[PDB]
């Protein structure tokens, strides 16, 4: 209970926490057995009379940066101020709260960019009250287009059921693009693993560490998802009908699969960390192999040439019959045989 | 009653009494002057700047009425913050942390607060204190403390302490920004030293701030009537502020643990480059000084005639070999 007192603010202040203030929109989809509408607008007061509608309603408010709209919707729909503070707190983990009239779910969607490997996270909130579902996002572009198309073109069961099936459809779409993201990260991790062994540079290290951190984020945001789907499936609060629980069970199994996949990826990147060091050691080995080969072949020749090239007053071997060619021949023989000796193994 | 604090030279007693309309300030060292302050129905605050002297703390404990064990906890300095409720008085344990920007170290000093009837005892360790704002607030009446009892005084003390926590967090935030900029721009072993010391400071801050949460929780959630219902909501605010501290602390650790990893992996990637340098130079100059020694053989058997610039021919062959080796290194991309 109570809205937490953040110091440095006026008491009871609702503040947006994220960073996206570019866009703001409201989109309404009122669908029934026979007829439907799509009332996309900006005047919040026009959306309100849908709270008491008989047919299921899907309200989608993008751009929660406008806290006045969120406060007005929460007040008219009878939503507790703590729920609103959770809505506007983007920095969070997926969670579920069951109330006497509405069910409040916090989920996360993710996007991945190529040529700029950033795992961008956008928090989306769902509030299922009566026969309506409120939806809160903070940027244009989501993964619920299949649901909109199914509703618009009357394909599937969604037009036949209540709003609980709508909430199930939304969560199913979220799990689907989770799978899509896992496939994209699979491709990226394969590319990075192949590259780290052939061109090991510091940018490979930076990319691998960024991938590892992204995977830690993914794990920390997927296990709460397992928890919330479990909470939706087992206890089945009164707002959710008893016939719609197998769907949530399927979504629960999907989340199990996603957790397994992210754990596998985490193990793979943990392996790539040691693989990089092994590869750089291999490169240093090649460089010093060249250095040690030239050293071994041409230092003994150098000191023997120095020894015969000395200023003793004696006359040991300075007038022998072509002694210089003999020295060069035997010396080249020893160099050739030691190069042959080094030709074993992978040194040469 | 053994004293373990590391501050011994400092000692002073100061009393601030106040009513709806009047206040009085008192400063002394002899405890005889602060004994008769029970009779003041209006709330009063007595501060013992130095607690090294066991005699004064023992006398004040036996005078106002203080359990032997909580008094021994007062004298003890290495103690986790705690709250104890007695019918006569309540006892609370707090910490103050000063952190110098230039001289990087996060120190501490222990405070004990005892609230019996209207007199609030504070047992400071040494000089250098934070609660100047509450002293100025009660000196110049621009608040609500005048209309409430010593309970609001305790609340004001704790609120000032959490404000000092916020200021320390701002300082640590500046240090973290500077450290991140240094790591991204230019690493160093002293940079690693800074990262490690900052990590340790964050760890100790988390360890010491977490008990304060349950301190405040005990102070409002199921509080006895000695802290008064009207005063209860105020403590709530303090609790909320505590949460922020904790939250901030954790995210700072989340940003300092991963700061150093790229440098940890990046070492031994200069090893290969220094091999590149040494190997190219050795490759150039091993055969070159080799043939230098070969031509310095002093054999004299093979004719060393002037020829067609024989010595320049030797130098030209040397330069050709050097150019060939440079081409080979370019091909190897070393």
């Amino acid at each position, epitope marked *: 209970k109570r809205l937490s007192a*953040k110091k*440095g*603010l*006026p*008491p*009871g*202040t609702l*503040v*947006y*926490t*994220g*960073k996206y*203030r*570019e866009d703001f929109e409201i989109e309404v989809m009122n669908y029934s057995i026979e007829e439907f509408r799509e009332f996309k607008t900006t005047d919040v007061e026009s959306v309100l009379p849908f709270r008491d509608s008989s047919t299921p309603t899907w309200i989608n408010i993008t751009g929660i940066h406008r*806290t*006045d709209v969120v*406060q007005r919707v929460g007040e008219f729909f009878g939503i507790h101020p703590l729920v609103l503070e959770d809505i506007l707190n983007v*920095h969070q983990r997926p969670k579920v709260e069951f109330f006497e009239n509405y069910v409040f779910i916090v989920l996360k969607m993710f996007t991945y960019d190529k040529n700029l490997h950033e795992l961008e996270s956008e928090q989306v909130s769902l509030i299922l009250t009566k026969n309506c579902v409120l939806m809160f996002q903070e940027k244009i572009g989501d993964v619920f287009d299949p649901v909109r198309e199914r509703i618009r073109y009357n394909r599937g069961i969604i037009r036949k059921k209540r709003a609980d099936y709508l909430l199930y459809s939304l969560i199913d779409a979220l799990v689907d693009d989770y799978f899509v993201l896992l496939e994209k990260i699979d491709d990226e991790i394969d590319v990075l693993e192949e590259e780290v062994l052939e061109r090991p540079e510091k940018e490979t290290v930076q990319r691998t560490h960024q991938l590892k951190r992204n995977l830690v984020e993914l794990r920390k945001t997927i296990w709460p998802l397992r928890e919330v789907l479990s909470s939706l499936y087992r206890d089945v609060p009164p707002l959710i009908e008893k016939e719609t629980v197998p769907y949530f069970r399927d979504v629960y199994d999907h989340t199990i699969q996603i957790a397994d996949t992210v754990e596998t990826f985490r193990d793979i990147v943990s392996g790539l960390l040691d693989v990089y060091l092994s590869s750089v050691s291999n490169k240093t080995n090649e460089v010093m192999k060249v250095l040690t080969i030239i050293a071994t072949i041409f230092m003994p020749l150098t000191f023997i040439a120095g020894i015969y090239g000395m200023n003793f007053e004696y006359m040991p071997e300075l007038r022998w019959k072509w002694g210089y060619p003999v020295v060069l021949a035997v010396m080249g023989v020893i160099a050739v045989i030691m190069v042959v000796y080094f030709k074993k193994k992978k040194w040469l | 009653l053994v004293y373990t604090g590391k501050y011994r030279e400092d000692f002073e007693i100061e009393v601030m009494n106040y009513s709806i309309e009047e206040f009085r300030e008192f400063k002394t060292t002899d405890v005889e002057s602060v004994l008769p302050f029970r009779d003041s129905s209006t709330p009063t605050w007595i501060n013992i700047t130095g607690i090294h002297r066991t005699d004064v703390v023992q006398r004040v404990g036996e005078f106002f009425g203080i359990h032997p064990l909580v008094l021994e906890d007062i004298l003890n300095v290495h103690q986790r913050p705690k709250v104890e409720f007695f019918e006569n008085y309540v006892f609370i344990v707090l910490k103050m942390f000063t952190y110098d920007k230039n001289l990087h170290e996060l120190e501490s000093e222990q405070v004990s607060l005892i609230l019996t009837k209207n007199c609030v005892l504070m047992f400071q360790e040494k000089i250098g204190d934070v609660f100047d704002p509450v002293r100025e607030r009660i000196r110049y009446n621009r608040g609500i403390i005048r209309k409430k009892r010593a309970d609001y005084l305790l609340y004001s003390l704790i609120d000032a302490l959490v404000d000092d926590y*916020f200021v320390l*967090l*701002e*300082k640590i*935030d*500046d240090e973290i*920004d*500077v450290l991140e*900029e240094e790591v991204l721009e230019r690493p160093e072993k002293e940079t690693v030293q800074r990262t490690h010391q900052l990590k340790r400071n964050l760890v100790e801050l988390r360890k010491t701030i977490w008990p304060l949460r349950e301190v405040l929780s005990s102070l409002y959630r199921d509080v006895p009537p000695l802290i008064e219902k009207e005063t209860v909501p105020y403590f709530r605010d303090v609790y909320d502020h505590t949460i*922020q*501290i904790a*939250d*901030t602390v954790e*995210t700072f650790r989340d940003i300092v643990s991963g700061l150093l990893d790229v440098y940890l992996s990046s070492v031994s990637n200069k090893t290969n480059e220094v091999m590149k340098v040494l190997t190219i130079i050795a490759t150039i100059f091993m055969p070159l000084t080799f043939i230098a020694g070969i031509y310095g053989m002093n054999f004299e058997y093979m004719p060393e005639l002037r020829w067609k610039w024989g010595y320049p021919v030797v130098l030209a062959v040397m330069g050709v070999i050097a150019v060939i080796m440079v081409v080979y290194f370019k091909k190897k991309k070393w």
Partner: antibody
Amino acid sequence: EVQLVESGGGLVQPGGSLRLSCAASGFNVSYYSIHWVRQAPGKGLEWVASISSSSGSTSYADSVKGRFTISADTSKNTAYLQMNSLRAEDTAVYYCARSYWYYIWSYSYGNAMDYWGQGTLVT
Amino acid sequence: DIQMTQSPSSLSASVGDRVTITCRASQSVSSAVAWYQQKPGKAPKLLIYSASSLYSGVPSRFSGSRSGTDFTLTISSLQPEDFATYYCQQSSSSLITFGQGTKVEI
């Protein structure tokens, strides 16, 4: 759409009393904090007052603390500033601005003024 | 008390060249600073908030940087419509303090 206007600037002898009214359109003054800022000719901007009409939160400038009085009435959806015992230096252009809070860290919040009123003149 | 000194007092530069205005705070401010543009006789406009975050609907030539307790407003490519006075801000405390005000001309 979201427009702030000011009224009440005029030729008033120093030491007098007057009232500046900031009328708001396109939004609700209840859900945002309204700031009053003063800029002198040849000088930079200088924040004066801040009101959070949702609560009693009221913060005046350091220089003129306790000499002004800011509030807001939601029936007209406007903010009010009461100026009493003016000085000679108070002659300047007054701007009324909305401001929203934003999040930096868990302990520290900031705020920014996104819409600025045209700003009356006081002498 | 807290104050924000903005340097330089004024700057003159051509069109299409980088312009940098630095700003220092008496007491450490976390990140709550802002940069504004004020045409003469007109209301100020909000350019940068959070010390690094570009406003919604404003050209990206303006950029913000933070180093320690110092903040820099930088311009990638100055324009003729960019000759005005730029200020700092503080939002750490309920007492908001503005910068000196640096005017950029041709």
